[PDB]
Protein: Magnesium transport protein CorA
Organism: Thermotoga maritima
Amino acid sequence: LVYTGKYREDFEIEVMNYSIEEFREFKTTDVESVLPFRDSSTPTWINITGIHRTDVVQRVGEFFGIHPLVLEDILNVHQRPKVEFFENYVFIVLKMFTYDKNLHELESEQVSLILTKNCVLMFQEKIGDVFDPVRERIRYNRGIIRKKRADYLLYSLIDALVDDYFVLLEKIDDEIDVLEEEVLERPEKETVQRTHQLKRNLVELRKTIWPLREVLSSLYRDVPPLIEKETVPYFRDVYDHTIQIADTVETFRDIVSGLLDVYLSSVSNKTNEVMKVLTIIATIFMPLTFIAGIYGMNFEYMPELRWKWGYPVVLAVMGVIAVIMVVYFKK
Amino acid sequence: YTGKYREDFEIEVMNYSIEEFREFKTTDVESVLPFRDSSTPTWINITGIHRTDVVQRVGEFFGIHPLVLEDILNVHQRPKVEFFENYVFIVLKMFTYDKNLHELESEQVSLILTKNCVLMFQEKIGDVFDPVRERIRYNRGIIRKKRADYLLYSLIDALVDDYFVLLEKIDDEIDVLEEEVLERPEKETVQRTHQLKRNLVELRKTIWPLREVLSSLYRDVPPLIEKETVPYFRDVYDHTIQIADTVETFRDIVSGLLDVYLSSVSNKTNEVMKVLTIIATIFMPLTFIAGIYGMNFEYMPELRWKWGYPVVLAVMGVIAVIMVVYFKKKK
Amino acid sequence: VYTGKYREDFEIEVMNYSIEEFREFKTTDVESVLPFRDSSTPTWINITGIHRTDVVQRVGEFFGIHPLVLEDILNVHQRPKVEFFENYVFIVLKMFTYDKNLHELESEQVSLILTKNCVLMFQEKIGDVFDPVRERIRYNRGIIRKKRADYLLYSLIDALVDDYFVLLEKIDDEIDVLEEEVLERPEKETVQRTHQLKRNLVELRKTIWPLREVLSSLYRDVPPLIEKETVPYFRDVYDHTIQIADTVETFRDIVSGLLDVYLSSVSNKTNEVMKVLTIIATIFMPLTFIAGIYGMNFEYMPELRWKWGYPVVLAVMGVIAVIMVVYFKK
Amino acid sequence: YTGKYREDFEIEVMNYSIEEFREFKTTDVESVLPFRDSSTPTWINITGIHRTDVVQRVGEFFGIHPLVLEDILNVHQRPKVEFFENYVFIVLKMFTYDKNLHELESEQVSLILTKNCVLMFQEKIGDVFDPVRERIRYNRGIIRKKRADYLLYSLIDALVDDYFVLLEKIDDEIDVLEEEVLERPEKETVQRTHQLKRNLVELRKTIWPLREVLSSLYRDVPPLIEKETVPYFRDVYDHTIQIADTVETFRDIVSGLLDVYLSSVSNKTNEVMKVLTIIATIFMPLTFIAGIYGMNFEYMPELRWKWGYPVVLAVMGVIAVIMVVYFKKK
Amino acid sequence: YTGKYREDFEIEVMNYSIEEFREFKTTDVESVLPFRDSSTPTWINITGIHRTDVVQRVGEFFGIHPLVLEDILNVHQRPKVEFFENYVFIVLKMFTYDKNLHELESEQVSLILTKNCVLMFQEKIGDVFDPVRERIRYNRGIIRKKRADYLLYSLIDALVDDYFVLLEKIDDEIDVLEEEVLERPEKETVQRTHQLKRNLVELRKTIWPLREVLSSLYRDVPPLIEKETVPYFRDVYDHTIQIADTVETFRDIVSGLLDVYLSSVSNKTNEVMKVLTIIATIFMPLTFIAGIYGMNFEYMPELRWKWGYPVVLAVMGVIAVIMVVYFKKKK
């Protein structure tokens, strides 16, 4: 039982119990008070913020009889999300992703959950979640959520996280748009260096999403303890969506991949543009300077003074050759 | 009001019925207010929303939230749908692209439909609702026999058709760009292509999230009657699919057209250097030789041989020429 | 609404068979293919020229098909998928064809609705890869007669799968030319031809990659038809679309390598020209400077005062350009 | 017939049992025909595939499909498994690589195993089945007790084992190619980088679909018996995965190897440019100064001073020194 | 023996049961041979497998196949599984990387497990089974009660984490290699990048065929208890799949980092070309001027025009200045 996370600071527990009629929400850090709520027939939603506590999670696991290694996997922040089936409860690991717009970094928070009977356990490492509008329907008695059990509520929680990826796709696309904008406009390698790290966050993103597909698929075609013919068919809808999601993400990966050579060639293009300017310079003075060197060379005979006006006659022939090539240029 | 148009100001009210119709243009804010209690759906035109006194008065007259009033003042906003018990706030944009230069102006069109009032907030003069005003005037369609619920979409359908023409505007410029890239390529073509894509991405930047905007009033519409605009948005959503796909097609066309001109010029980099080289190679070695006799010594090679003015210039010239055979060869 | 480019040709053919015999005919009658719905024997029906929105509707209304599904058929631009029901199964397919001369891949959407034992094939123009399949249905070759429409349609789809393998050859045929074009005598505009191939390569992923789960959906479901029969046969074909996409993914790295080759030789021959230009200009730079000082105007002329100054200067600066040749190729 | 060998022609027949053995070399087509009814395991060598009359005569004597017999003439066909009623048709390919000159020669040999007879359609003389013939001749192992169904594996294993040596032939030249890249890089290195990879691409392009050739029988073998020699196929069935992974490994190494070379060339490109820059630029303003004094005006400020000729030569020298100080930065 | 270690010599034999325990290192072979007949699991180590006489002695005494005994001598072998009626021959590898340098040393490990006894064959000194021996020494877990089939598995899992630590060592070299590219990128970086790259694929080159090794044991193992072959063996087979993505990630990193480094070279080159450009453009046009007056002709305007010398000094300096204003922008 070792928590290798980055947040051992705050700790908070919130419990929301409700039926198809009544409703109650409260925040009790008392571990003993939330124990008899397991026997409640009504769906009991329990929040645990700050999963860093090795004694609290264990104590909760002791009363529920949760497997020791499972309690350790929760504390393990370095783990791929997956789902394990059991005779009583369901072991599920999820990952909440967040991306700041100013600085470019993908911050995350592992969220594991265990659902038995009608008990709902949401585990957090810190403050923040996207299940706030979900609590609204639980509070305002909105929709068929109350009439449906925690199995449908879990999906409402699953789809709530899925919708965040769409919002993330908005962020991803926006960052790409700004990134590809600087490619043609600014021939400077600054965000281009940050592009690889931004693309690194994109690769690691799909690296979690792709196996998460099979994580979901293991539920619908199985779910031994959960009910059937209702939840699974309706829930597969999101499973049909998450397939479409990463495929759009995979498309983004190929776009940024070949975008590097676009900027790379753009640098050489503007570099060549400098060379083209540099080209026409040394090609018009050097041959004419060569002529100036000829008259600069003294000899025993000088027909320049013998011929009529040998000085201004040279000033005319030089200026012509430098112009007749200009037409040939800019072709 | 964060807009750039605080010049023009105009308020028009076009109230109709199942038979007759009336219209008038009054600058008085208090004159367009008592038409709220009109049994028939009242259509109101508001051009030049820069005047905050109208936003404040009417806002407090219809009972509009101060932040919602600020949303109208905010000319930079993403299209969405705000559900309330009184009205429905929707952000819309009017795009106008000139074929002369790649530029697309965007005038935000907010709307607040409560009771029997239909508000159209314009930032400046110009819209596509002019032929729509005729149907309200000439009694054309079931727009007269229906309330503000159908009157709302009657405006939307015109705005939807505006993008179809815009697609033609782009497609026309695409064919021009196709004639500009595939053949007769030149400078600033990329700049025209970039700004076109910049407007193309910005186009979808409003249209793509506008899909879910249509989905907001697709399965809902709580206060007004439904199953009327539902098959409408069902057809409208089929339109925006082809729109973005036409955009997505052009987005890859842009890249396809870009890579050609980008790789070609970057490939001609060495070609320019090849020309620059063979021209510069016949300068530096010859330039020094011409400057040799421009020096003073103890002996003169001119008097060493008869007719010492040619100083063997023809021979050295030929030797400079023979280098060509050495060049031009396969590298 | 049919938005395709083929509203000309039209053909209807019905190929019914049993575990022993077989029958086939080509009639344009719409009311003749309808009473063959209740036929227990597997009935393969052809519909070429899907442009007719009235025929599809008429046939669709008789089968009790959802109006939108009929409209999905009319739509010629659609991603391949599978729609499960309690009666029929709507599956979207595609037929890709590439011409070697002008680099372009034409496409034709194939929709099908299989109920009971009846088989429906919806096309636009003439031509398909089900021709050798029809032979076994006609010549009674194998268990293609005994097995119903569950394995028949599977054999039809599997026949379509191998068509893309032939297309992969056609892609490789262009690669072999691309291998010849880029390397042997590097030519301009090849990058454009390369990008078009790359654009068509990624375009191919738009169909095949989601087609994986299309086969996977039929792999562990099939609610209306009998399961367990053709289910394990779906596995091999499901491994094909994965193997194909890997070959498509493989082509991405192959062409990308050749893409830089054309730029490699140019960049390689670039410095080759520069290396020659380098040693030429630099060595004559200090030499030109020296000879200018003598004939120039100064307040002191120790040059003529130097004993034998003329011959020594000419040869003392010659070695400087020679020692660089030793430095050359280091 | 699309073959390239219409020169040599030879037919050898080796027959054996669980006790004895017999062999004879008769190029006659009508002489090896009555050996079809031989209950004992028979092995027949068929070299001289150019003969359209000899091959088809033996083929039609066995009752083999005409078009199939016509396909034997063609030496251009994908390696696969043709399932029949008794015999199975597989065209095995062999790739020989000479280390000196980068070249991958391809000989395509087809086999037909009917009853107890074994056919081997060679294109030329020479194979790796020579030690295989020895065990048939010298009674070595269970090659005598077991029939041709097990011998067929010994034929395959003898062919596959050559590819392991073929990988060594490539790996040998890879290490040689490494020496050309790691040190002393030059022209044609990119060619050797490709020509070795070109044949390597051609190699896997044949082996990768040849992997499923094994799987076609390893999971089935419909005409003959099973449960024998089948688990032995699994050994080689892992070899084609072992080889391809080694091939795929080489494909990634060679690709990255050329990238290093291209990176080196581009790096050494600027390296020459850097030398060209720091040497040419420092003499540009120097030569300009000498031309100034070369001018002859009416007023000479030089003679106005007193012995400033070495002064000019000294002040210009220091300016060229700070260029190195101006260097060592980016 | 085709190895490089014919120097070191070490033999370790460890027997244990559900009650007692005994560990020792005896060079006497005839003392550990009857220990095979013991029902209690006897783990035996043979370091310095170069000695063919011992392999021929121990091997032929157990009836081990002669060619297999020679296969051990061959250090160039693919990791595989050889099933027999009594024992099982498995080829394994132990990779090790040293920091502050680029070198990946390897050591082939062959094992022959008969009855309950385990034979481990080493090439050189060193293993990660040191803490494993301690758990058997201190009676930790059910490793004492279970037989060799689980004992070998305990050795397998010990080898798994060894590469996991090595995966951390890779990233340690990456971050250093990254820093080399992230800031002040220089020559020989491609070489260092290749050193990791050449060892990157080489790592997975042996891992992939070592995966089916775990699978082959998971499917068959006829002589040992198949009850022990629970998904724990496939759990090990699941870890290597994560290694595949871990290596594949590094493959994308190495490919990307090398490109970013090479992309900077274009900026490195251009930076030099910018300085190289502005030099020749401000001297040669002025050099041509000095060459004219430096050249002698017929008519001399220098002595003709008043102040011939100071009048030329002014115009030359301005020409180099008027270009600066044109410069310092996008060329």
About this structure: The domain at 258-331 of chain A is CATH 1.20.58.340 (Methane Monooxygenase Hydroxylase; Chain G, domain 1).
